[PDB]
Design a protein around this ligand. Sequence first.
Ligand code: CLA
Ligand code: CLA
Ligand code: CLA
Ligand code: CLA
Ligand code: CLA
Ligand code: KC2
Ligand code: II0
Ligand code: PQN
Lengths: 170, 126, 69, 742, 42
Amino acid sequence: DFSAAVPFLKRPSNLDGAYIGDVGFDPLGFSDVFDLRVLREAELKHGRFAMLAVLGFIVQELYTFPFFPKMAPVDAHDYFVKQGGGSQIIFWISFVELFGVVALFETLQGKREPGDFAFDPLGLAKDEATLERYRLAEVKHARLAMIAIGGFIHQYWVTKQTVLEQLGNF
Amino acid sequence: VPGDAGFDPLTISAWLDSRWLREAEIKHCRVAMLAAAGCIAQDIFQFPGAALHDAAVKAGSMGQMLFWIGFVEAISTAATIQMLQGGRARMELSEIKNGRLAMIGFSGMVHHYFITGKGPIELLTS
Amino acid sequence: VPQTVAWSAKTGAVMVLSNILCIVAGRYVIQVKSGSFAGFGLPELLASTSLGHIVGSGAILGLSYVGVL
Amino acid sequence: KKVSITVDRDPVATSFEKWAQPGHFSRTLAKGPKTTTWIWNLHADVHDFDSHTNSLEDISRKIFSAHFGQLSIIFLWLSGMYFHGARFSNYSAWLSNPTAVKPSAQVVWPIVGQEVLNGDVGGGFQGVQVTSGFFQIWRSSGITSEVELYWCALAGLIMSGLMIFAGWFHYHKAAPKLEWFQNAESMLNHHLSGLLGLGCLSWAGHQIHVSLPVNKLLDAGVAPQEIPLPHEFLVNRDLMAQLYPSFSKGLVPFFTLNWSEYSDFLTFKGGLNPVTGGLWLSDTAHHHLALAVLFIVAGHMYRTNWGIGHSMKEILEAHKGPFTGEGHKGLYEILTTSWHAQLAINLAMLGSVSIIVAHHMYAMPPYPYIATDYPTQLSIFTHHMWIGGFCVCGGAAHAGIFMVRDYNPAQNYNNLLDRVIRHRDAIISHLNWICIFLGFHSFGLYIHNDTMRALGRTQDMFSDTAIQLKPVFAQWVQSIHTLAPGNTTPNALATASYAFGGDVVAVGNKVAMMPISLGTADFMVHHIHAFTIHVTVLILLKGVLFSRNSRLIPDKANLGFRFPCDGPGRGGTCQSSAWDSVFLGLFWMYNCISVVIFHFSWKMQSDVWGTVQSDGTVTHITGGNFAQSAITINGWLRDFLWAQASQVIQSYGSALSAYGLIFLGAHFIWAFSLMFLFSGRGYWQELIESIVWAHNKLNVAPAIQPRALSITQGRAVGLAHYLLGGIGTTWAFFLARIISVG
Amino acid sequence: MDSNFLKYLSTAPVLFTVWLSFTASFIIEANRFFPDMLYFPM
Ligand code: CLA
Ligand code: CLA
Ligand code: CLA
Ligand code: CLA
Ligand code: CLA
Ligand code: KC2
Ligand SMILES: CC1=C(C#C/C(C)=C/C=C/C(C)=C/C=C/C=C(C)/C=C/C=C(\C)C#CC2=C(C)C[C@@H](O)CC2(C)C)C(C)(C)C[C@H](O)C1
Ligand SMILES: CC1=C(C/C=C(\C)CCC[C@H](C)CCC[C@H](C)CCCC(C)C)C(=O)c2ccccc2C1=O
């Protein structure tokens, strides 16, 4: 047996296609050592944060609420840290994360999918087929966005240019 | 199997795994062929805006290359461990023979540069 | 400071002598293994030449210390 | 290839079920408590793996993963030491003024007035002064900034996570088989070559490429933030050849055996660096390179998978003569089948090594500015003397556990153990006679002197100004060591240590080291040391030799290693087990190590440490009173304990008031221990009966019936509180005294 | 949450350490906000 993504490497044996997005890529082998449900929830949580973050970086350059002073997004962090606005965001995120801990227990028991928080306000996913397309898409967008996050945070560090301005410039 | 000439005076094959040895030889063959081709080609033409290792490390080219090669090697190490756990043929023979040839030629080219401070093809022209 | 010398063929001579000496000694004294063509393998050769580089390094440094060079 | 890796996959399931079942590991405790003894029995026997399991394989697996757990704790501890240096310390200020700033890496919160403990340590900082010598380690390493201390802290945390992962993995996922653990030749080859040899070689590489250039720039006087970062020495070989011109030649002299090129940075100077009062770091670099070479050479001795090498069994069985029967036959089987025999050896050697560390680090101060930081010198000498004494007594504890449990007479016929056991009366009677002879002629000299000085007869005393007991052999050895540079160590430039004789090394007008002269007081206290060591050996050896049987109890092995007695008959057999000789030998270890650290503290204050005033005269901390006052007990009581306890007892209201409180608290705990040591279990069970009655009267009696502690546990609790109180009293006394005056 | 992990957290040493740490902790907080109370203020 060999992994589909990388031909020379072997199929991990816990990656059997059970979870969407499985291409057999697990060279280190963490899937064997640890429960995959934890890792899939972590992957979705990390990716969802990253997808939001890359959009947030771009949008903040495009438009900013007037009351707060306009700042570079990477360095905005420090101003919010002193102001107390950043603490407010952390507290609410932590409050939701508390419920996330209970949800993690639900996943371990088997009552919950790894990343399912039953969020369908706009009812975008009409049927199972469109949901399947969306879940594979969400995995890809999360993975790519995790790469993209730090893509221009690190670029900001080498070159002090807004990612939009940097993209146009040079 | 390819590149077998029954050459083992020191009988290294008995005391080390064959799969590791042949994989090590093929990796060395590939690196050597690339390096010898690069040494002749680089004298022929210069890439735009670009002992040479020192200039490169100051430029920073080697450091980024090291990170990307290291990533490929880390992914590869899982594969080599898996192998240790457990006309195309003519192309394999050509790949190993040309590689062995480069492993000799490149070593000559670098040592030639120590002696004369010249690239191999230019040295002959001069 | 004890006086050492840059490498010359004399240094090589001492090293070669010591390595061969230990190869013959290893054919005699290695208890678990055609005077040199029976049972001679890579670990025996690599061990006798490792002791050759230890005996040879000591002999080179000592002969440099006393003036024999 | 009979040396191979063999592993059971997924042996033990990672479950929380046995967490909820205290006592699961033994058949006795797993059925639940009925008396309070169960609770104590749970903790007493928990890491006694060979008492729960019969198989050597499961015992070995438990030991390997518990060693990973200990490593995880040590790495967390080191990471915390680095983080407190990075975040809560005056390290950066101390780098600029090592002789003025006092190291401090602990800051207290203001709660009940306890913020008085944040004393003025210097460098615009307030905190608790620390004495572990970490600042001098970091300067020797070449840290020079708090940022690098944060990176060291993160490296420690990552190692801690990897060790706790490895312990879990190697117990629950991939546990090696017994034949893996029983590879003594392979383990020794890797631990000599790989662990110790590459440890020394890698550290030598760091010293050469980072410690030497950074510390040469520091001792030249360059400010720490003005010094190039440690990798610019690695790359810019020209910048390294500025400081050490031999680097212009690279590694060609190494490979061609022209090693005398490297004498810039691989020296054999000896003595101390005049600027820092520490060892020359070029010497430490050469030392670690040479130790690396012969540890890698030594790790090639034993045979593993290719026919070259020694069999340790053959070496042992071949060494036998006409006095010793079959010789060392059967010792390989003992040391590859008993963990207790291995722990007995390794604990005795580790304790001895810690005692050697204590002597060698005060006499040949290895770190820059540690010799004139007197609180650190006293702290690390005292600390490593206590670690040494404890580990030596645990070596005899586990020799007794081996003899009681893992010893089999059938496999040990007429070899060295059989013969020691078959003349143990001659050994113990001759040791007993030596301890009597040596207490009479060492402590009795002190009593003779107390009497003569008290009677007005000072011409009748053993002293320098009277009847003299000179240490001529020690004085002669000191003479030889001062003559050695240029004579018997011709290429050395200075002596190994100035303690043997020679110059006074002063750093910041404080003495780093200076010759430690030996007189009548030194003769007397060295024979006090030989007496207390011989008596401790007598108690521990008598426990090991008589652990299985005596003339008193012919079947002591059936009662075990740890039993309280065998009844009041035969006149009384209280404290007859091997455990009770470890219990009695830890008191005499405490006595021995207490006299050693008192001798060190008084001698160093009286004759070594102090300030160098103009004209080169030295004013010592206690003004040279050791010579004429350490010869009587009244001198030790008055001029050492009474005179030097002034700082602990006057410390209230200062930053040293914590030491005054710990001085009193440890006096309390020590006295409280005597309640458990002088008492017996039967009194306390009868008192508990009336207390239980009062609970029955109110219908509030517990279902876990209260018991007086066992006889052995009363002894263990008494000993623990005795050592805690006595060591704590000395810890507080030593630290407040030397922080105030040194 | 696992019932065996909760049965572990119900063991006597865990509850004793947690309860006395919580107890020590509100003594500490009460002496932070209301220090030096030698007497009941009346
Ligand atoms: C390993 C050795 C070690 C030691 C002895 C200390 C000691 C100390 N640290 Mg340091 N520290 C260390 C490592 C260490 N630290 C490491 C590795 C880090 C990096 C993360 C730090 C980072 C750090 C910071 C950032 C601070 C300290 C502070 C302190 C001080 C107060 C700690 C306190 O009261 O909080 C008590 C905090 C609590 C939340 C109380 C917890 C009590 C519980 C009940 C203990 C229970 C354990 C539990 C029952 C175990 C069983 C688990 C369970 C499942 C059964 C004290 C001097 C403080 C200081 O110096 O301020 C000036 C401070 O601010 N430490
Ligand atoms: C080169 C090989 C090597 C090395 C370095 C070690 C090292 C160690 N072994 Mg040994 N061991 C080896 C081979 C080796 N072993 C072999 C072949 C066997 C089978 C016969 C064993 C069987 C064995 C047993 C049964 C036990 C050990 C234990 C230990 C630890 C002793 C306590 C100590 O000093 O740790 C502190 C010192 C340190 C230096 C901590 C280092 C932590 C890592 C693991 C060291 C190696 C890291 C890596 C190789 C370095 C990378 C360098 C890179 C940056 C360039 C120590 C980690 C004991 C232990 O504690 O188990 C955990 C123990 O009970 N080992
Ligand atoms: C061992 C191989 C090797 C190494 C270490 C270098 C290293 C270097 N070369 Mg040389 N070079 C090489 C091969 C090599 N080159 C080859 C094969 C060619 C012919 C195409 C050249 C032609 C060349 C020129 C013309 C110039 C350099 C230059 C440079 C320097 C800057 C980096 C750069 O632009 O290179 C770029 C090199 C390439 C793009 C060639 C890459 C070819 C191989 C096939 C890449 C494969 C990458 C692939 C993704 C990995 C596959 C993994 C595997 C699992 C399949 C640097 C010192 C420049 C310099 O500073 O000199 C003054 C310069 O002007 N090189
Ligand atoms: C409960 C155990 C314990 C504790 C808490 C300490 C605490 C301390 N030790 Mg001590 N130590 C102990 C046991 C202990 N020691 C034992 C048993 C030994 C004997 C091996 C030593 C030998 C020792 C030395 C040699 C040094 C310390 C130092 C220190 C201090 C700094 C800690 C540090 O970062 O180490 C840092 C340690 C180093 C930078 C150098 C250590 C070099 C040794 C040779 C490493 C040997 C490791 C090797 C695997 C052990 C083999 C043992 C052998 C018998 C086979 C601190 C006061 C250091 C000190 O005094 O600084 C002021 C110091 O230099 N310790
Ligand atoms: C590497 C070191 C090492 C190792 C692995 C062992 C391992 C072992 N020993 Mg040995 N031992 C050692 C060192 C070591 N010991 C030393 C240094 C001594 C000398 C004191 C002894 C003396 C000794 C005796 C006398 C006995 C053992 C026993 C045991 C076994 C049972 C352990 C157990 O369940 O205790 C559980 C652990 C505890 C109950 C911990 C409490 C111990 C003290 C009182 C607490 C520590 C106080 C703390 C440090 C300070 C508190 C601060 C205060 C201010 C509050 C186990 C095989 C026993 C046995 O039967 O073996 C078969 C046994 O009878 N050992
Ligand atoms: C040690 C590694 C090494 C290898 C594996 C190697 C292989 C080859 C091959 C294999 C296909 C050829 C065909 C080749 C050709 C020549 N080599 Mg080169 N060569 C190596 C190193 C050196 C050194 C150290 C020297 C040297 C020389 C010459 C000269 C004569 C010129 C003269 O005599 O002056 C010629 C024709 C000398 C020199 O460089 O002069 C410029 C000299 O000293 N080589 N060399
Ligand atoms: C789920 C749920 C709902 C919802 C919702 C929400 C909020 C959905 C939001 C989804 C988002 C924000 C998806 C964004 C993905 C971003 C990616 C993949 C990154 C691309 C960047 C790349 C590739 C790059 C790059 C680059 C680098 C690094 C730096 C540059 O110099 C260069 C460059 C630009 C090339 C609603 C409420 C609608 C209801 C519904 O019933 C259920
Ligand atoms: C006081 C005493 C008791 C009774 C001691 C008891 C019952 C211990 C009391 C412990 C109580 C129940 C809890 C208090 C514990 C402390 C607050 C802290 C303990 C710290 C460790 C136990 C964790 C004995 O049983 C005994 C037996 C043999 C010789 C001497 C004596 C002896 O002196």
